[PDB]
Amino acid sequence: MQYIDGAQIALYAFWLFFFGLIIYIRREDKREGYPLESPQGPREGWPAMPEKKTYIHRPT
Amino acid sequence: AMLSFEKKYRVRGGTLIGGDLFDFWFGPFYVGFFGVTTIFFVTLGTLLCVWGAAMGPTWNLWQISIAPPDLKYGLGLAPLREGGLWQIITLCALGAFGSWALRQAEISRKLGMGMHIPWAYGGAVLAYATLVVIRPMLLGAWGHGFPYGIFSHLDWVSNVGYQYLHFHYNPAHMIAVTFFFTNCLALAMHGSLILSVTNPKKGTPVGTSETENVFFRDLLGYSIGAIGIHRLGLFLAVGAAVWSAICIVISGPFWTKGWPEWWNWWLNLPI
Amino acid sequence: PVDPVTGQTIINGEPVVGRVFIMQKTDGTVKLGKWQAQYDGEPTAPEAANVGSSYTVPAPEHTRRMRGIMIQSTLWSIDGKRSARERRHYRPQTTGAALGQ
Amino acid sequence: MTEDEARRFHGYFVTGTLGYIIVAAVAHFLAWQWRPWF
Amino acid sequence: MLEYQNLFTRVQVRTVPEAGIEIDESTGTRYGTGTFSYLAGKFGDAQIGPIYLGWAGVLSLIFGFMAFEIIGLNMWASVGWDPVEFIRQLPWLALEPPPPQYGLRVPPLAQGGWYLMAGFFLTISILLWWVRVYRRARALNMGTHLPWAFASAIFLYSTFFFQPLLVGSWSEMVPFGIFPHLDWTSAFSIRYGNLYYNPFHALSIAFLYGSAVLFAMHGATILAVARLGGEREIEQITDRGTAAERSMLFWRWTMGFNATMESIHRWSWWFAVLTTFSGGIGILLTGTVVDNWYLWGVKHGLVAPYPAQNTLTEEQQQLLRGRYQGTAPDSFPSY
Amino acid sequence: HRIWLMFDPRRVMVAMVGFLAVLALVIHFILLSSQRYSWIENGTLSAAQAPVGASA
Amino acid sequence: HRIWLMFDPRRVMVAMVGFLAVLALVIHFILLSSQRYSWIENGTLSAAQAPVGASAPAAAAEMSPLPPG
Amino acid sequence: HRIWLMFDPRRVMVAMVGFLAVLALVIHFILLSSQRYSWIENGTLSAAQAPVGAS
Amino acid sequence: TATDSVQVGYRGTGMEQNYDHGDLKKQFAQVKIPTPLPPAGESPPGPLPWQNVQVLNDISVGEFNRTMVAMSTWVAGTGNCAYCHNIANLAADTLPNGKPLYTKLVARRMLQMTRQINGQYSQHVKNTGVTCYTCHMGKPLPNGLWFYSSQTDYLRHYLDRDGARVVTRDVAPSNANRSSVKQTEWTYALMISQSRSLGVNCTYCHNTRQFASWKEAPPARVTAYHGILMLRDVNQNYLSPLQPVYPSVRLGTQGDAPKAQCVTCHNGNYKPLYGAQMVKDYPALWGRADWNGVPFQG
Ligand SMILES: CCCCCCCCCCCCCC(=O)OC[C@H](COP(=O)(O)OCC(O)COP(=O)(O)OC[C@@H](COC(=O)CCCCCCCCCCCCC)OC(=O)CCCCCCCCCCCCC)OC(=O)CCCCCCCCCCCCC
Ligand SMILES: CCCCCCCCCCCCCC(=O)OC[C@H](COP(=O)(O)OCC(O)COP(=O)(O)OC[C@@H](COC(=O)CCCCCCCCCCCCC)OC(=O)CCCCCCCCCCCCC)OC(=O)CCCCCCCCCCCCC
Ligand code: BCL
Ligand code: BCL
Ligand code: BCL
Ligand SMILES: CC[C@H]1c2cc3[nH]c4c(c3C)C(=O)[C@H](C(=O)OC)c4c3nc(cc4[nH]c(cc(n2)[C@@H]1C)c(C(C)=O)c4C)[C@@H](C)[C@@H]3CCC(=O)OC/C=C(\C)CCC[C@H](C)CCC[C@H](C)CCCC(C)C
Ligand SMILES: CC[C@H]1c2cc3[nH]c4c(c3C)C(=O)[C@H](C(=O)OC)c4c3nc(cc4[nH]c(cc(n2)[C@@H]1C)c(C(C)=O)c4C)[C@@H](C)[C@@H]3CCC(=O)OC/C=C(\C)CCC[C@H](C)CCC[C@H](C)CCCC(C)C
Numbered sequence A: 001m002q003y004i005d006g007a008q009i010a011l012y013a014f015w016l017f018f019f020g021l022i023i024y025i026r027r028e029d030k031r032e033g034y035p036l037e038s039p040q041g042p043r044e045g046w047p048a049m050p051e052k053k054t055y056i057h058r059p060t
Numbered sequence B: 001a002m003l004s005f006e007k008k009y010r011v012r013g014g015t016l017i018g019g020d021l022f023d024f025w026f027g028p029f030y031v032g033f034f035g036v037t038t039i040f041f042v043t044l045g046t047l048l049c050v051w052g053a054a055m056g057p058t059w060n061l062w063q064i065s066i067a068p069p070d071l072k073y074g075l076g077l078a079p080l081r082e083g084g085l086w087q088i089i090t091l092c093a094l095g096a097f098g099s100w101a102l103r104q105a106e107i108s109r110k111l112g113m114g115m116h117i118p119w120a121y122g123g124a125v126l127a128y129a130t131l132v133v134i135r136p137m138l139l140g141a142w143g144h145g146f147p148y149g150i151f152s153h154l155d156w157v158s159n160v161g162y163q164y165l166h167f168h169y170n171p172a173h174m175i176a177v178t179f180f181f182t183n184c185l186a187l188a189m190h191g192s193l194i195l196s197v198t199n200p201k202k203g204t205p206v207g208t209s210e211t212e213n214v215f216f217r218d219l220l221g222y223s224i225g226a227i228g229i230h231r232l233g234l235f236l237a238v239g240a241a242v243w244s245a246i247c248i249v250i251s252g253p254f255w256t257k258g259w260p261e262w263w264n265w266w267l268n269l270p271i
Numbered sequence C: 001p002v003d004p005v006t007g008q009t010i011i012n013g014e015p016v017v018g019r020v021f022i023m024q025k026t027d028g029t030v031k032l033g034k035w036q037a038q039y040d041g042e043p044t045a046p047e048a049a050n051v052g053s054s055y056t057v058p059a060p061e062h063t064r065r066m067r068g069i070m071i072q073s074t075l076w077s078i079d080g081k082r083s084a085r086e087r088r089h090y091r092p093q094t095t096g097a098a099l100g101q
Numbered sequence D: 001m002t003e004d005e006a007r008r009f010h011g012y013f014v015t016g017t018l019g020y021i022i023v024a025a026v027a028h029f030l031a032w033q034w035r036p037w038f
Numbered sequence E: 001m002l003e004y005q006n007l008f009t010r011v012q013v014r015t016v017p018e019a020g021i022e023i024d025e026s027t028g029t030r031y032g033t034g035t036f037s038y039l040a041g042k043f044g045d046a047q048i049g050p051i052y053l054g055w056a057g058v059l060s061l062i063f064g065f066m067a068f069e070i071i072g073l074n075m076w077a078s079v080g081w082d083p084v085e086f087i088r089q090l091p092w093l094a095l096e097p098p099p100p101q102y103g104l105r106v107p108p109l110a111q112g113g114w115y116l117m118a119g120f121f122l123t124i125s126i127l128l129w130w131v132r133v134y135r136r137a138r139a140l141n142m143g144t145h146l147p148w149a150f151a152s153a154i155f156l157y158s159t160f161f162f163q164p165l166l167v168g169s170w171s172e173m174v175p176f177g178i179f180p181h182l183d184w185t186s187a188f189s190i191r192y193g194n195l196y197y198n199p200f201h202a203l204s205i206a207f208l209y210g211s212a213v214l215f216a217m218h219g220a221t222i223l224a225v226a227r228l229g230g231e232r233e234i235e236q237i238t239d240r241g242t243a244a245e246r247s248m249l250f251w252r253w254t255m256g257f258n259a260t261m262e263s264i265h266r267w268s269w270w271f272a273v274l275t276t277f278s279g280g281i282g283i284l285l286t287g288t289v290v291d292n293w294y295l296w297g298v299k300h301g302l303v304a305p306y307p308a309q310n311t312l313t314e315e316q317q318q319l320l321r322g323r324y325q326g327t328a329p330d331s332f333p334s335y
Numbered sequence F: 001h002r003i004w005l006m007f008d009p010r011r012v013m014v015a016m017v018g019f020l021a022v023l024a025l026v027i028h029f030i031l032l033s034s035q036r037y038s039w040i041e042n043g044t045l046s047a048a049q050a051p052v053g054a055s056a
Numbered sequence G: 001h002r003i004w005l006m007f008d009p010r011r012v013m014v015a016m017v018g019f020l021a022v023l024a025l026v027i028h029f030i031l032l033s034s035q036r037y038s039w040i041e042n043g044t045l046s047a048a049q050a051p052v053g054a055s056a057p058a059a060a061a062e063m064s065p066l067p068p069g
Numbered sequence H: 001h002r003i004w005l006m007f008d009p010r011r012v013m014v015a016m017v018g019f020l021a022v023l024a025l026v027i028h029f030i031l032l033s034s035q036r037y038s039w040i041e042n043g044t045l046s047a048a049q050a051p052v053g054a055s
Numbered sequence I: 001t002a003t004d005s006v007q008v009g010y011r012g013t014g015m016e017q018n019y020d021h022g023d024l025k026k027q028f029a030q031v032k033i034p035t036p037l038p039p040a041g042e043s044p045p046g047p048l049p050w051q052n053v054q055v056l057n058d059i060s061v062g063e064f065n066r067t068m069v070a071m072s073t074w075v076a077g078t079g080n081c082a083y084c085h086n087i088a089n090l091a092a093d094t095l096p097n098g099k100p101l102y103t104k105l106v107a108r109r110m111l112q113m114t115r116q117i118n119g120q121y122s123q124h125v126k127n128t129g130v131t132c133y134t135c136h137m138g139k140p141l142p143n144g145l146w147f148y149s150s151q152t153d154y155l156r157h158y159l160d161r162d163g164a165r166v167v168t169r170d171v172a173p174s175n176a177n178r179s180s181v182k183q184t185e186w187t188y189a190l191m192i193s194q195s196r197s198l199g200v201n202c203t204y205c206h207n208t209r210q211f212a213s214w215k216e217a218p219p220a221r222v223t224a225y226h227g228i229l230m231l232r233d234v235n236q237n238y239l240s241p242l243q244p245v246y247p248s249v250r251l252g253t254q255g256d257a258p259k260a261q262c263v264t265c266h267n268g269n270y271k272p273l274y275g276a277q278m279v280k281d282y283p284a285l286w287g288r289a290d291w292n293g294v295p296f297q298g
């Protein structure tokens, strides 16, 4: 409309995309050394730790 | 909370100042003597930044500006209304940046690591120190520093750049930009290279170090090493900050005219 | 207003103990408003451009070889070499018939 | 460092230091005759 | 004295040059055999190895050399074919875009036709190089991360074509020249009201600095654990050793959070890509959606207040009004 | 003296010479940049003609 | 003579020549960029005609080298 | 003499020729950039007609 | 180096002027100002005893001689009546051989030009007018002489071309402003020349965060605008029409009269001659009824 313009809409779309990307990368960051060990028990931050990822090696 | 392999590494020793008093972990953070010094300067500096916002006309995050003193105060400590608050915050920032570097050196010493991270960080601190300490001292007033505001310090950069009528013609600025652009290109190449080998075409095994070297020789005829790329990235990123510090410290203290006129020397070669 | 006898400032009928000053923000700065409000106290909008209705082709000796817009202030204002100053423009031309050839 | 050559070094260091200060004092004497600063 | 900082290599090995992993050679082949540079081995790998050439590479080289030739020949003609002036004035020479009044129509050859032709050939060369990069990646069964990272930079490059077309004139294009393209950068920022207040421009600044920060941090981290074998990142990713653990622990103790040996490269990739992506969006919005970024920033509360440095009377407000710039005078008047 | 058993004579001598050379260069350049003692230009003036700072 | 057993003679000569050469070039270039001793241009003037720096100067009215601010 | 024992003659010769070549170029170029000794332009002037610095 | 900084804007904005101390001191020293002639303001109230005086018709005889010695030392050096006059007959506008004395016609026109500058353009030269010295510097040929070169030469902004604005006064684009980037480069080159002609940078006249704003800019910008207008009145009406008077050696390759720019008066300083005031002691040069309340004798 009058106050809302294209640059603002594009900026907020980029903000949503960036937050989603940060969530995805933070999920990838928790593929080693998790879950955390604490006296109260296991701990995971947000985002939660993802599923176990397995690699593929060449045959001998 | 600790990583599943973290417990065996949390040992004493490696500090530069203090003993078992400052050799503990607060949550995930390691707290040393310089961790305590960092928190003091961060808290004091941030609270004075909030006070500077409350003194100003707005609470809008983008419009908050704490400005340096007038040039007439000339290396003195101005009244806190008139820019003295900026100088106090600058001291807190210097203390916090220095404490952060020394805290990093303590952590690497405890982990049996090299000292590269503190010195790489020192390149950024040197650029900041040139902007608010070295260049203002050479020009003779603390008022030559930049204001503390999200978009206020962009206005300072614009006006200072136009103090020489075309800042693109600064020879050291041209080199520093090339370092920044080449670093971004090299980082994209390095990030892609590792990810492409570790996450290859679906159904195929993970590649090797030969795959990287063969790929970049096929594309460009030369492949820097696995250690070569990390050496180059350190050189490009830190050298960008060092050449930035040079480019701003020569404008005013050494060159006062327009930067296009500096290229007379090239046009007046005898040949 | 000021008390006629004591000299004390009166605010809403009550005297004030002290020297009263009008509170202001840092150096009397006032938060900006709408973007249209930026143009109060400024000159009005500029007039439309003067665009020629016809074009006449200049002589070659009056035409610049270099088409860079800023060449006159960034290079020529600092360059005094006579050979380059000669190369700056196109040279006059004629025809073989005009010369009799 | 046998602590005995330290005495030998000390005599040379003291004489060199005191001799340098005396020569610099004459230089300040000459400069005062040319243009006093007080 | 000081420990070994892993900054240079003193002892270099020499073996037979690596010919390379077997690949499909039907539409291309490897040229050279592989030489060794003593100076290059001090910093990185010494082999100036064979280079692969195929359809896309050859076509890209032909088109790019055509563009380079056109640019250089126009530059040389601009100084009257003087070689001394060509070398002496090389930073200031340019291949200039067409005049504004032609819009998107074809300009004359000496007044922008060469510019458009060179730009077309450069664009074709860049696209063919992208195809070559993609084929090189998929010939070794690698993932296609580098092709899309390159596509981001290509997007930023192509905004320099799309924005002038969206505003409706090839005159708004970037001239081919060392100092002239900086002149265009400055004038483009000035014309559209202080590009510092373009939010996507600020976003691209943030990602450029973030790229520098990330590469400094990663390079220092890997060099600090290179004595433990951290430079062999693939091994530390598929089988985590003590170097990866120490890197993780250093950054967790310093910052309160960390990455892995693999995901730090994802951080790097995304920062580098987002630089040019946000920059391209910001360029695309300029002159088409927003014509004055300072006024947009005032609208959305971005501009900090300053005391007024001048005030004008009403007659001064009418007089200080100017005129928009127009055409140059095509006559030399006599008075 | 016993101080040389505490400090290396070589390290002290090098550091002291480096300090003195820097100090001497700083003083000579401070006077050269001044008005009263810019001796290369005004050194031939007598003490009465040499510039003096303002009494203000 | 004993100072050569404390400092390596090869290192001292290189440090000595480097410092003396730099100092000689600095002094020669300082004098060449001055007004009184620019000997390449004004070397043929006698001592009477050679430029001299300004003595204790007077003041000026309404004329300022610096713009107001 | 014994200086060639302390210093390699081959290294000395290269450093000396390199220094002399640079010094000669610097002096020749400084004179060429001056006004009194711009000999390529004003070399045919007599000593009385050559430029002299002011005062 | 030693640098002198003058603050021209609000603190922290980066609006400052920088000068090299050595260069500024040398330039200030090398500039010499001619001492004013002793006043001559007592003469009988009789008719003017002159033959061909058409400009200085309201000036006493003693003042006439005073200002004419002043003109001699300002333009042609002390004495040197022969630059503009036949010595035997100073009332002659032609040489004995018949050819006209072009210098005298130029001087007569430029007396009127100086009066016009001082009287009708006080909004630029306020209380610090101009004499012959400010442009001539004791020499017949002033600085900053420019001629017809090409269509895109920005100095024609001072002759016959009007309009330099390129910035839109809206948030959204419209047809009200269709300035190109190339026109912005043209304005940039013109303003680079303007900055170099006064020894100042952009911030002396602008807050570069918004070049189009006058409220955020120093007052000098207004002064600068008036300068442009004054130039368009000096170049179009006084310097250009003098074309058929000069010998061929004074014209350009297109055969046009010399024209003036900002550097003609300023010579690379924020004020001409660092703001020296001379015309206050020369009533024949200012076309005002009073300079600073000092009445015009008449
Ligand atoms: C983007 C997405 C992700 C965004 C987010 C990204 C996050 C990245 C980091 C990830 C981790 C975050 C969690 C974390 O750090 O947890 C620590 C702690 C658990 O710690 P712990 O494991 O139990 O502690 C271990 C160990 O330290 C045990 O020692 P002890 O139990 O003896 O503790 C002694 C400490 C604490 O005592 C104190 O008095 C410290 C109090 C600090 C907080 C209050 C500050 C104000 C009062 C100050 C004191 C007043 C007098 C008492 O004593 C110490 O000395 C410890 C070191 C303190 C620092 C060094 C000394 C500084 C001295 C100079 C400065 C003084 C203050 C100006 O857990 C919690 O605090 C639970 C809540 C965690 C979430 C944050 C909640 C924040 C709420 C407020 C938000 C405000 C937003 C603006
Ligand atoms: C204009 C030109 C510009 C400039 C030009 C821009 C072009 C587009 C760029 C897009 C980003 C590419 C990022 C990247 O790493 O690319 C390299 C990769 C290489 O893959 P490959 O060589 O084919 O094979 C390698 C592959 O095996 C492993 O790849 P890697 O792991 O490194 O990364 C690929 C994936 C991660 O893969 C997985 O997660 C698969 C794991 C198994 C399945 C997962 C569980 C099941 C899930 C089921 C539900 C899920 C099913 C999907 O990473 C990505 O694709 C990037 C993810 C991060 C970015 C998105 C973050 C969220 C954004 C939205 C937030 C919204 C607000 C909250 O190439 C690819 O194409 C990857 C696949 C891309 C999938 C998304 C495509 C979206 C297209 C959108 C437009 C379509 C037309 C309208
Ligand atoms: C306006 C300023 C003045 C001026 C004022 C001064 C003043 C004042 C002094 C100098 C000094 C020096 N000046 Mg100055 N100087 C000027 C211009 C110059 C110029 C020049 C090109 O214009 C040059 C090259 C110099 C150069 C020098 C150096 C020789 C010296 C500083 C370095 C040093 O410590 O050396 C070391 C050089 C030596 C010769 C040291 C010798 C030391 C030995 C050990 C003495 C041994 C004595 C004996 C063995 C022992 C006796 C023991 C007991 C006492 C019995 N000056 C101008 C004209 N200069 C300083 C100095 O030391 O002067 C002597 C000093 O104080
Ligand atoms: C009209 C304006 C001029 C101009 C005027 C200037 C001026 C003036 C300067 C630059 C400088 C720079 N310019 Mg610029 N510049 C122009 C156009 C450009 C263009 C372009 C595309 O046109 C580019 C690419 C650049 C590029 C650059 C870089 C070379 C450099 C900035 C990086 C730097 O210094 O990092 C150095 C890094 C730092 C200073 C950061 C230090 C950070 C500290 C140590 C830590 C902070 C921690 C923080 C407080 C923590 C917060 C809390 C936590 C988040 C929880 N310029 C135009 C032509 N440019 C700047 C420079 O060189 O600065 C030295 C500078 O001052
Ligand atoms: C007065 C000048 C203006 C200004 C005007 C602009 C303009 C205009 C632009 C930028 C843009 C950018 N500016 Mg800015 N900028 C200013 C001030 C700054 C400052 C600062 C110190 O204040 C900084 C740090 C920056 C930094 C940046 C970057 C973040 C960004 C470019 C990203 C990039 O990687 O580009 C480099 C990357 C590319 C060009 C990608 C494409 C590369 C192609 C693929 C290469 C092909 C090469 C070919 C094969 C070989 C050559 C062939 C021959 C030609 C024949 N600017 C001020 C405000 N800036 C850009 C942007 O995105 O803005 C939103 C942009 O267009
Ligand atoms: C090689 C040089 C490049 C680089 C490198 C680099 N930066 C680094 C490192 C390295 C190697 C670290 O190890 C260190 C780190 O720990 O990162 C996680 C860091 C880091 N780089 C940071 C930021 C940063 N680096 C920048 C620059 C760069 N850093 C260069 C491009 C910039 C720019 C260009 O703007 C920024 C914003 C931090 C995330 C971090 C350092 C954290 C730190 O020092 O924390 C202690 C201080 C605080 C938590 C806050 C202190 C607040 C002050 C007391 C008051 C206000 C300060 C300031 C004056 C405010 C001004 C605001 C206005 C300008 C808006
Ligand atoms: C993440 C964003 C960053 C980015 C990324 C990026 N760039 C990339 C890639 C990636 C991920 C590639 O895969 C690709 C590549 O292959 O890199 C090695 C590329 C690339 N980035 C390039 C450049 C580049 N990137 C830049 C920037 C950036 N690249 C961003 C900062 C810039 C800048 C800052 O302006 C430049 C100039 C190329 C090296 C390459 C793309 C190569 C290409 O497209 O080539 C086309 C071929 C030609 C034009 C032919 C040229 C012919 C010669 C000019 C003539 C030779 C004549 C004679 C034989 C020699 C003469 C010598 C002289 C020319 C010196």
Ligand SMILES: COC(C)(C)C/C=C/C(C)=C/C=C/C(C)=C/C=C/C(C)=C/C=C\C=C(C)\C=C\C=C(C)\C=C\C=C(C)\C=C\CC(C)(C)OC
Pocket: E068, E069, E071, E072, E073, E075, E076, E116, E117, E119, E120, E123, E157, E158, E160, E161, E173, E174, E175, E176, E177, E178, E181
């Ligand atoms: C002897 O020497 C010779 C001459 C033989 C060779 C020497 C050559 C030399 C010395 C060359 C020097 C070249 C230099 C210095 C080049 C500098 C280049 C720079 C700095 C360029 C910077 C920026 C340029 C940009 C961003 C240009 C972008 C252009 C684009 C995107 C153009 C696109 C055009 C298209 C798609 C055109 C399409 C054509 C149609 C008709 C379809 O549309 C109009």
Ligand code: HEC
Pocket: I049, I050, I051, I052, I053, I054, I055, I056, I057, I065, I068, I069, I071, I072, I075, I076, I079, I080, I081, I082, I083, I084, I085, I090, I091, I103, I104, I105, I107, I108
């Ligand atoms: C050129 C700059 C001149 C110089 C060097 C001198 N005069 Fe001189 N003169 C000049 C001009 C433009 C006029 C006409 C002024 C007008 O028309 O308003 C004159 C005229 C005179 C006169 C009167 C002529 C007459 O009798 O009709 C005299 C007496 C005169 N000029 C004398 C004079 C003197 C004493 C000078 C000092 C050396 C001198 N002139 C120099 C222009 C110039």
Ligand code: HEC
Pocket: B165, E190, E322, E323, I163, I164, I165, I166, I167, I187, I188, I191, I192, I193, I194, I195, I198, I200, I201, I202, I203, I204, I205, I206, I211, I212, I213, I220, I221, I222, I224, I225, I228
């Ligand atoms: C005082 C002498 C100034 C100096 C120094 C600079 N500028 Fe300026 N600017 C000045 C005036 C009087 C005008 C208007 C002239 C007219 O004919 O209207 C301008 C205008 C500009 C503009 C255009 C503003 C617009 O609304 O479009 C720009 C972009 C501009 N000036 C930029 C600029 C630059 C780049 C300068 C240094 C090289 C500079 N200005 C200096 C006054 C003065």
Ligand SMILES: [Fe+3]
Pocket: B190, B194, B230, E218, E222, E233, E265
């Ligand atoms: Fe890596």
